[PDB]
Amino acid sequence: DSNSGGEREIQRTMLELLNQLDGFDDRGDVKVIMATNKIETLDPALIRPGRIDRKILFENPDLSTKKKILGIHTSKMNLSEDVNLETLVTTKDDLSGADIQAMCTEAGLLALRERRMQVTAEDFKQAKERVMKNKVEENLEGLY
Amino acid sequence: GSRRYDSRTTIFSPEGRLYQVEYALESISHAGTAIGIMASDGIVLAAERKVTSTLLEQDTSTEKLYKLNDKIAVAVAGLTADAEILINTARIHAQNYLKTYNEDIPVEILVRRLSDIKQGYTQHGGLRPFGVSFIYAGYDDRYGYQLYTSNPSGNYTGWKAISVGANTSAAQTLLQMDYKDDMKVDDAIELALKTLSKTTDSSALTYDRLEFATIRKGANDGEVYQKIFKPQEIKDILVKTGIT
Amino acid sequence: AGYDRHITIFSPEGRLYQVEYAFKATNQTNINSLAVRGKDCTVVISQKKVPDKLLDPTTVSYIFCISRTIGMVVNGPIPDARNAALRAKAEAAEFRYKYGYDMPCDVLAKRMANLSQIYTQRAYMRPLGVILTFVSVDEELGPSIYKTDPAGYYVGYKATATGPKQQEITTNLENHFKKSKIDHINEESWEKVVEFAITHMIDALGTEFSKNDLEVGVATKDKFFTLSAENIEERLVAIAEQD
Amino acid sequence: FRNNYDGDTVTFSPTGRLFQVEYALEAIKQGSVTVGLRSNTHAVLVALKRNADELSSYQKKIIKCDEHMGLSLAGLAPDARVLSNYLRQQCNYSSLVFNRKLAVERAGHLLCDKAQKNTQSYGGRPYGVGLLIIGYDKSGAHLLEFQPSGNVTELYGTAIGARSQGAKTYLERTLDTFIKIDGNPDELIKAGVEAISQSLRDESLTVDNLSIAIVGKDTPFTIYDGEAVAKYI
Amino acid sequence: GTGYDLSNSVFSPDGRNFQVEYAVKAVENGTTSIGIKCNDGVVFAVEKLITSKLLVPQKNVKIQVVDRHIGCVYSGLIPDGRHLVNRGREEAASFKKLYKTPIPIPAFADRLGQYVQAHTLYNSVRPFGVSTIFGGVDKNGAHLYMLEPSGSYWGYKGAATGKGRQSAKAELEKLVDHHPEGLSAREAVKQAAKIIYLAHEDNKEKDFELEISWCSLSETNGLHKFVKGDLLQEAIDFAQKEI
Amino acid sequence: DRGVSTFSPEGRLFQVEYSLEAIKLGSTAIGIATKEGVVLGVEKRATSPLLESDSIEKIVEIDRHIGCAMSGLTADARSMIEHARTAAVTHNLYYDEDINVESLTQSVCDLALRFGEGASGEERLMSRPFGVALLIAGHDADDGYQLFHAEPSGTFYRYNAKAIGSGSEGAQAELLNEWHSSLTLKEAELLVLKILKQVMEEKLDENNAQLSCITKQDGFKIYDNEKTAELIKELKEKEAAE
Amino acid sequence: GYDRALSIFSPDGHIFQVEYALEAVKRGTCAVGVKGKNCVVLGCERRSTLKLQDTRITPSKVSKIDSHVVLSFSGLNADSRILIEKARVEAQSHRLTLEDPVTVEYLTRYVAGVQQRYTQSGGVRPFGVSTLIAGFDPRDDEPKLYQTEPSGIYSSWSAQTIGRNSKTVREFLEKNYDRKEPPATVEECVKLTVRSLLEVVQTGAKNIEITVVKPDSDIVALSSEEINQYVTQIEQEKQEQ
Amino acid sequence: SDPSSINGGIVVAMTGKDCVAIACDLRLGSQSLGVSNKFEKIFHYGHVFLGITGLATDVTTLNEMFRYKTNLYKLKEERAIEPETFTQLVSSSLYERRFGPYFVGPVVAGINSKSGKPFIAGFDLIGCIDEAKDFIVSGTASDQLFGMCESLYEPNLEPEDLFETISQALLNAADRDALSGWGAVVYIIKKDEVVKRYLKMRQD
Amino acid sequence: MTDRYSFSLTTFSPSGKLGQIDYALTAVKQGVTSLGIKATNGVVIATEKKSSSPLAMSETLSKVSLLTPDIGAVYSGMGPDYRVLVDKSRKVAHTSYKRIYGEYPPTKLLVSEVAKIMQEATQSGGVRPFGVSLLIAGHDEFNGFSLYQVDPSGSYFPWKATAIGKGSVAAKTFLEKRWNDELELEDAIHIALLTLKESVEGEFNGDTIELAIIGDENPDLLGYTGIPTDKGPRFRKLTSQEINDRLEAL
C-alpha cells in the first residue's frame, strides 16, 4: 500500500540495473552477483547473459553429503558417546543445508535448558520431530 | 477476442509443472483433515469437519465421508462442491461394472476410472481441475483390504496409512513410528484419536467435530460390513480410549 | 489483470461493474416517461423528441405494441430497445400456441427478465442497455405495471417513471398518493386518466408540450392502442380550460 | 506498429481503418508483379514468375478456371488456391444447375462473399493474395481487381505486385489505344509486355519468366508458357 | 481500467460503446450517398468517386436492388455493405416463400435492424461500419429508412451520409420548405443531381460519377431501376446550371 | 500470445515465419535430381554412439516410383506422410494409374495452412502448421524425374539440386557450380557424399548418413550399409588427386 | 469444447509447450533399461521421500501392454494413464483388425504417433511423460528397445535412461557397456541395471523395481528379496576393487 | 406373434394380516423345449420383493436395470426403498421405451417399514400401474390364477395359513400350462424375517 | 461459432483458494439479510423486503418461492440469479423424481440437486458462479424437519438455525442462546421476530417482512377432498394481516 509507485516504477528501477551492466563502462573490476529463491518472476531481459556466462544451480544433498555437513556443525559442539553421526543422516529425508543446522540448533537449545555440556541422544530425537513438522512443510510439487 | 481473458489454465511452466494443479494442492491444506488407517482385520477412516459450531446439525450429516458401495467407503477432503461431481459419477461407474459383469467392483478399477476424469480437465477442456481429494477404502478377495487415495492431479498410489488436509506432514510423522502390521481394528482407532487431537487448532476434542466410518468383518468370511459410526457411538469410544 | 472490469465477474467489492454501466446507458437519449395505474385500465405517457425535421413523426415512437392486450414502453437507445421488442413478441406467440390463452402482463415481464439474467450471468453476452416497462390490464388482478430492469430484476410498481429526472418525477407521483392514501386513480373514464398524468408531467418538467412532443399509450381491458396526433392534442385543450 | 488496436480482427481503429486489411494488402505489394488489360473482343493477362534460386523452377502465377475465363495471383500462392476452388465450384454450379457459364460480373460478387466472412468473424483471416479475373461472355470482355478486403471493381487494366503501381503509367497513356484494337490479338499481347517492362529493374523478361494468357470470343482461355511466349518478348 | 475500446461487448464507463463510435468514422471515409422521399415513391442517388482514368464508365452499379420494390445504397466499406444486402436478399426470399406478397418497406427495416444488433452482442464478430440507405414503395404509401452502424434507424424524409453528409444532408432541409405540400417523382430526380453538386465542393479534388435510381407508382409502378437515356443527361444540365 | 491467423506487419502470418526457422534447427537433407535418376540423402546426426542405424529413418516411401526425405523436426513429418500416402495410394484406386509428382505435392502442401481456431464454413482442427520441410521426388512417363520441396508456407518449387536444414545456406551455394545437366547416376552418388562429408562433424560412415535412389525400373531403393560403404571408399580416392 | 490452440512456434523456431514439457520428465523418477541377446531388462525406481507404501496394492511402475512387450515410463503420472490405456486397446484392436499379434515396432510408432496428434490438435496439450517400450516380436528372439519422447520422436537404443540424473547414467553406460558385444545371459543383464541405479537410488531397496522381459511371452518380476541379492554381490566387488 | 409367451412364467401375490406372499416357479424353457429348471424369477431388492415373468431376455436384462436405480436411491438416503415408492419407479422404467418396450409381467409385493401396512402392486406389458388389496397376477399362465385366487383367497388370513392358501392356488394352476412347473418357490414377507420354502410337485 | 469462451472464469488463486467463490460470499452480505429457525413442530424462516422505490408493490415481489409443496426456499440480497436457480430447480426436481419416482424428493435430496446446478457454474466454462445463497427447509418421512444452508460456492451444510446477509454477524450469534431442543412452531416465530427487528433500520411492518412457516398438512391449502392419503401441503405463506398479528405480540 505505502511504497507502491504503479507501473512506472517497474520500468525505471529494473532497466536502471540493466544499463549499469551495459551502458556503464568498467575495466572489469566490478562484479555483479544476483541470487534469490525464484529468478523466473524477474524480467529475463535484466540478466542479459552476454555479461554473465556462468549459471549455477542447486539441489538437495544426498546421504553422503549430509554426513560432511553434519560433522561441520558438530565440530565445535560437544556430543555424547551414544550419538551416532551416520544414524542422524539416515533419518534425514528431503532436507537442505539449512535444515541440518536447524536440528543442530534445536538440539543445543534442549541441552541448554538442562545445562548439559555434551548433548545426549534424547535431544536429537525431539529435534528431528520439531523440524520435520513446522520448519519442514510439504512442497506444492506433489507429483509421485 | 477470447485469448486475452483466457488465463491459460493448463500450460507447461518453465519449471515443468502445471499452474492450476500446483495451486489446487494448496486448497487441500485449507480443508478438513482426513486420515485413513488400514488394519489387519479392517480399515479405519478418520475425518474432521471445518467451520463447526453449536448451531450445526449433529443428528444425520456426513460432510467428509460417503458410501460408494456396500463393501467400499470413501473419505472426502477438499472442496465439497467439486466433490459431489466425482461422487455422483463414482456410483454410476461402480454400478455399470455391477450391471454388466454382475460382480462387486474392486477399488483399483473404481479409482482409475475416476482419476481419468481429473486427468481429463488437466489436459483438454480448458477448465479447472477438481480441487478436492479422495481416499478410497474397500474390501476385495484379490489383494485383500485395499486403501488408496487420490489427488487433484489424478494420481493414486497404495498407502497403509494416509493423511491429507491440514497438517499433512505433521500427522504422517506420528503415523509412521506408531504403525504396526499386527495392529487390529481396536488398536487402529486409538491411533487416529491421538493423531487428530494433537494436530488440531483447538484445546480439547469433542465428538461433534469428528467423523469415523470403518469396515468390519463379521463371523462369516468373504463379506464385510460397512458401518458408519453415529454420534452416540463416537462419544463412547472417546471414554474407553481415554481421549475424552 | 485489468480485464476484471470489462466483463461480468465477482468484483473484490462484491458487485458487478458491467451491470452498473447498464443503467447508465438509458440516460444517453434523455427521454423522460412515466406510467400510472388507472381504475379499470392503465395509461402510459412518454416524451416524444424528434431531433431533425427529416424524421417522420408517425415512424418515430418509443412505445411498442407487443400484443393486442399488452403495450410496452422502453427507455434508452433504440437498437437495444427493439432487440428485446421482437424477443418479447416471440414469447407472446409461443405462449398462445403451446401454453394456452393470451399472455398477461406479469408473465411477459418475468420471461424477459429471466432471459436477461442468462445473458448477464454468461460472460460472452453483454446485458441490454435499456429498461423494459410493460403495461396491460389483467383479467384477475386488474391493471398492473411491471418494470423490468436490465439486471434481470422485475418488481411491480404503482406509478413508475424513467429517465434521469425520474427521481424528481417520482416525488410528484409519490406526494399525490400520500395525501389521498390511494394506490390507484379512482377515475373510471380513461379520458380523464390521460389528462391526469399529463398535468403532473408538465408541472414537474416546467415545459408545455405539443401534439408532436408527446406520445400517450392507452391500455384498456383486452385492448391496446396508441393515440394519434389529433387525440393527444384534444387532451391538451381541456387541460388549459380546467387549469 | 505491430499489434496495438486492430491486432484482433474484430477491433476497429480510432482512425476508421483496419490494420488487418492493411497488413494483408501490403502482402500483394511485396509479392510477384503482374499486369493486365482487355479490349472489346479480347483480354490479355501477363504475369511475371520469380523464384529463390536459378536452378529452381517458376511457380505458375496463372490459374485456369474454365475455357472462357481465367485469373492470376499476386500474393501468397496457397491462399489463392482456396479462393480458386470457390470460383471453379461456382463455374460448375452454374453449369450443372443453370447450364450457363459463370459471368465475370457475378463472379466478383460471389468472390467478395467469401472474404467478408473471415473479416467479420474472429478466428478467420482475409486472403492476402490478389486476383485479376478475366473472361468473356455475351456482353464482352471484363477485368476485375481483387483486394484482401474483397473490393471488386471493373477496370480496363491494372497491375498488382512489386512496383506494379508505377507500371500503370504506360497503361494510362495507351488507354485510348488498346480499347479500340479489335481482331488483333498479337498487338494486344505486345501491349502488356511494354507495360510490365516498366517495373523491371534487376532481371528482364525471359523465356521462363514471361507468362501470358489471352482470352477472347473465338479464342478460349489458353496459358502460354515456355517457348510459346518467346516470340512476344 | 484500460482496454474498454478493444473488444465489442465491453461497455464504456458512461454507458456507450467505442467500437460503435469507431464504426461511424468509417462511414465518413467512403463515397457519399443521398436520398429523397416523395408521395409516389423515393429517389436514390449516390456520388461514386473515380480514382483514375482506368475506371470503365457506367459499368459499375453500387446500388444493390432487393427484389423489384427495394433499392439499397450504402456509404462506407464496400465489403460490409454487400453483406447486408445479401443477408436481406435471403430474408426477402424467405418472406415471399411463406408470406406470399412481397415484403413492404417498414417490414424490411426490421430484418436488417436485428441482424446488425446481433453483431454488437458478440465478441467474436464486429459491427458493420457501413451505413445503408434503403427504401421503395410498399403496399401503403411509401417509406424510407437509413440503417446506422449502431442499428438505430427511423423514418426519414431524406437520408444522406458520407464525406458530404455535413453539406448534402444540410440541403435537404431547404427541400422541405421548398415543397411542403408534396414533390413529384420526376422533379426529385433533377433535385437529387443538384444536391450532389452542392456537396461536391469537398469532392472537387477527384473525379465523380452520377447514378440515380427511383421507384414509384406513377410510371415504373413498383419497379426499382436506374435512370438511363436522355433523362439522366437532362438532370445533369439542370443541376450544373446553378453551379 | 495471439491467434494463429494474426498477420505480421510484413504481410505474413507469425505461424508461417517461425515455422521456416525450425528447418535449420534439425538435420541436413541434400538431394540432386538428374535425367537418369534422383539421388536423395539425409543425415541421422547421432548424439550418442549407442544409437542404432535403423532407429531414425528420414527417408520414407510413398510409392514404388515416388519417394521423399525429411529434415528438421520429424514429429510433423510422420503425420504428413500418412496424408501423403493417403492422397497417393487412394488416388491410384480412383483413376487406375499413378499420381503425378507435382499433383501429389499440391495435395500435401494444402494441408499446411488449413489450421486455425474455430474456422468458419467447415471443420478444420489443427493447432499449428507443419514445421518440417519435405523434399518430394519421383518419376513419371511425361515430365520425367522431378524433385520438389514442400515448405511450411504452402509453396513448392522444382529443384534440380536442393539442400535443406542446416545446409540451406553454405551447402546450398556449393551445388550451383557442381551441378550439370549431363550428370549421370553414378557420378551424382559421389557428388552428394562429397558435400555430406565436409558438412558432418565426424567422418562419413553408413551409420551417420543414409542415402536412397529413385529410378524408372527399380523405382525407390535404399542403399545398403555395405553398398554405402563402397561409395565412401571410392570418395576418398576422389578427394586426393593432385 | 475448447478450440483454442496451445503449442505455438517460438521466435527461435522451437515450441514452448514442448521444451517446458520435457522438464517434467527430468524431475521424475529415473527409468533405465538395457537389452541383451536373449533377454531385456527394464529397471525403475520409486519416490524415496514417501513411506508406508505397500508394494502389493501399489500399481507396478512397469505397465504390461502385451504378453511379449511391456512399457516402463518416466514423467507425469497424470499423462501416463492416457497412453497406457490407449496402447492396450489398440493392442487388442490390432488383433481384431489384422488378426496379428502386435509388434514392438508397431507399438512404438503408434504411441509416438498418437503423441504427434495432441501436439498438432488444437485444444489439447502434449504429454509430459516419456515411455520406454521393450519386448520381443512374435516368432522373433531379437531384442527390441525403443524410446518414446514427449515431442513424438522415437528411436532404438541399446542402453538408454530417462529422468533425473540421466546424463550421469548415460556416460556410465557408454564406457561400461558395449553395443558390439552384449551379454548373452540374463544374470549379467540384471547386474548391469543395478550398477546404473547405485548413483541415483543411493542405497535403497524397496524403492527399486526391476522387470525382466523374456521371449515366448515370459515375464518374471524380481521380488524385493531377489533384487537385493544382486545388489550385495556388486557392492562386494565395488569397494574392494 | 407373442414373444412374451415363448418362455412363459407365473407370478402370484396375496395379502394376509401384516403379511404378503409372492411366489413363482423354477421352470424357464424355450418355446416347447424346457432348458433350465434352476432359474428363479424373483430378485432380492431387500424387504421389497419384485417378481418378473415374461421373455427371458427381458427378465435377465431388467434385473440389472432395476438394481441400478435402487442402488442409487438407497445409497443417497442411507435407507431401504419402500414398496409404494418402488411401484411408481417400475412404471417409469417400462414407459421409457414406447414402440420398443420390454414385455414383462412384473408383480411387486412388500411391507412398509414405517407404517407397517402391507402393499402389493402389479404391471403389464406396457407397465400400467395395477393396485389391488386382494391379489394381483400376470404373465401368460396367469389366466389359471384368476380362478384359483378368487375363490380360495380370503381377506384377513394368518401368515402361516396364507402359505397353504397360496400353495393350493399355485401348484394346481401350474399343471394347467405347459410352460409352468418344475417346482415352485414361495416367499413369506413379514416384519421380522422372510421364510423361503420350496414346493414339491410333479416334473413334466 | 456462437461463443468463443470455453474456459472457466473460476481459477485457483496463488493463495490456495478460488477468487470467484471468495468474492461471491462477500456479495451475499451486500444485501438484505434472511434467516430461519428449525423446531420440533416445524421450520420457521423469515426475511425482509427492501423496496428500491417507495411506490413499489411488495405483493408482486415474493422472496420466498416454492420448489416442492413440502419444501420452501429463501435467499439473501436482491437475488439476480435466484430466479434462474429456482426455475432450473423446479425442473430437475420434478423430472428426476416426480416424473420417475412419482413423488417429490425429500429435503436432503433436493438440496443436493440445487447445489448440483450451482457446482457446475464454478467448473463448466462460459458461465459465472451464482452469487446467491439459499436455504432449503422442508419435511420428509425419514429425516423429518431439516434446514440446509446453500453456500454460493456450491457446498451445502445442515444447520439448526442460521442468518446470512448484511447482519449475518450479529444475527447468527444471537440465535445460539435462543435455540434449544424443545421448541414449537409459534414459539420459534417470536425468536425470528426479536432477531430480525434489530436488523431492520427502515420501516417495520408486515408488508416489508415475508414470514414463511412449514406446519402440518393443511386440507384447506390442498384444493380437493375425499382422499385421506393426501391431506395437503405443509408449506404455507402467511398473509399481510396474519404477520402483523404477531408483530405486536412481542
XYZ file of C-alpha atoms in Angstrom, chain C residues 2-3 5-7 18 21 24-25 28 52-57 59-62 78-83 86-87 123-129, chain E residues 1-4 6 9-16 37 110 114 117 120-123 143 145 150-158 169 172 176:
70
model
C -7.217 -5.170 -15.701
C -9.786 -7.254 -17.597
C -13.883 -4.637 -15.133
C -14.537 -5.403 -18.820
C -16.829 -8.420 -18.247
C -20.781 -4.049 -16.209
C -22.935 0.751 -16.526
C -26.171 4.459 -17.270
C -26.908 3.633 -20.922
C -27.909 8.709 -23.213
C -34.450 16.570 -37.129
C -37.334 17.658 -39.346
C -36.478 14.864 -41.804
C -37.863 12.283 -39.354
C -41.432 11.095 -39.848
C -43.351 11.648 -36.573
C -42.477 6.314 -37.645
C -40.595 7.549 -34.565
C -42.096 6.067 -31.402
C -40.788 4.965 -28.009
C -33.484 2.230 -29.773
C -31.209 -0.630 -31.020
C -31.235 -2.378 -27.640
C -34.885 -1.336 -27.272
C -36.089 -3.034 -30.465
C -33.801 -6.015 -29.811
C -39.006 -8.699 -31.153
C -37.891 -11.157 -28.467
C -19.743 -13.665 -19.883
C -19.923 -13.877 -23.696
C -23.133 -11.804 -23.882
C -23.460 -8.180 -22.899
C -26.551 -7.060 -20.962
C -29.161 -4.854 -22.577
C -28.583 -1.133 -22.155
C -9.299 0.299 -16.343
C -7.672 0.023 -19.766
C -8.913 -1.587 -22.964
C -12.601 -0.631 -22.942
C -10.604 -3.107 -27.513
C -19.379 -6.146 -25.731
C -17.344 -4.095 -23.227
C -19.326 -1.022 -22.202
C -17.754 2.359 -21.558
C -17.999 3.904 -18.068
C -20.590 6.376 -19.407
C -22.759 3.632 -20.922
C -21.697 3.759 -24.586
C -38.728 10.642 -50.295
C -36.632 -4.896 -39.070
C -31.979 -7.084 -35.669
C -27.887 -5.917 -33.353
C -22.879 -5.866 -31.312
C -23.780 -8.594 -28.785
C -20.814 -10.871 -29.595
C -17.068 -10.507 -29.105
C -41.262 4.778 -46.585
C -35.015 4.217 -43.819
C -25.351 1.282 -34.227
C -28.544 -0.279 -35.600
C -30.574 2.860 -34.867
C -32.994 3.856 -37.620
C -36.301 5.641 -38.143
C -38.422 7.015 -40.957
C -36.523 9.635 -42.959
C -37.942 12.193 -45.357
C -34.364 12.214 -46.626
C -27.935 16.459 -45.982
C -32.401 18.519 -47.568
C -38.963 20.573 -47.189
